[PDB]
């Protein structure tokens, strides 16, 4: 019931490139607040790179920072927040779990929204872990593979063809 955790302003058009990362954040507010936090942290860092001075962008980022400060406080004594190494592993491993879920569906020839979303979200989470520093080679490889699969399978199903 912290007011700072209430919804943000509408996303500025300048920040279109982080719309899906922010959506991922909010879909995890209950499910996994650690993921919710770091997705917002990435959105904040990326948004500042893009535009922190245009009034709408400055206002949006100011509210996002309010929400980050509140959420960090509320997460309290959480290892994945107090220890960057653990936070990075938490996100990397959550990405890997949905990646391997989607891979298992793919290998079985089971194509559906959930595994498409799992591939795509895995790729978004690898974007997010750039907040911890340089990506590993395997990070780069997984993000590319996952986003390719999400796009490819989606397009095939849209056209009625088996991937």
């Amino acid at each position: 019931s912290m007011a700072a955790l209430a919804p943000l302003p509408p996303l500025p058009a300048q920040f279109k490139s982080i719309q899906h990362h922010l959506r991922t954040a909010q879909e995890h507010d209950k499910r996994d607040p650690v993921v919710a936090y770091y997705c917002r942290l990435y959105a904040m860092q990326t948004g500042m790179k893009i535009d922190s001075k245009t009034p709408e962008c400055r206002k949006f980022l100011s509210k996002l920072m309010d929400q980050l400060e509140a959420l960090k406080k509320q997460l309290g004594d959480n290892e994945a927040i107090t220890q960057e190494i653990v936070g990075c592993a938490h996100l990397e491993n959550y990405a890997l779990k949905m990646f391997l879920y989607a891979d298992n569906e793919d290998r079985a020839g089971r194509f559906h929204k959930n595994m498409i979303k799992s591939f795509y979200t895995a790729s978004l989470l690898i974007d997010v872990i750039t907040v911890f520093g340089e990506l590993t080679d395997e990070n780069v490889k997984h993000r590319k593979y996952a986003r390719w699969k999400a796009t490819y399978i989606h397009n095939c199903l849209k056209n009625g063809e088996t991937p």
């Binding site: 942290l41 904040m44 860092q45 500042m48 922190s52 001075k53 400055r58 980022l61 100011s62 920072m65 980050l68 400060e69 960090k72 960057e84």
Partner: peptide
């Protein structure tokens, strides 16, 4: 840019 938002951002990471 080095502004007040980036300074608040750095404080989160401390």
């Amino acid at each position: 840019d080095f502004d007040d938002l980036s300074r608040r951002f750095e404080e989160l990471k401390k």
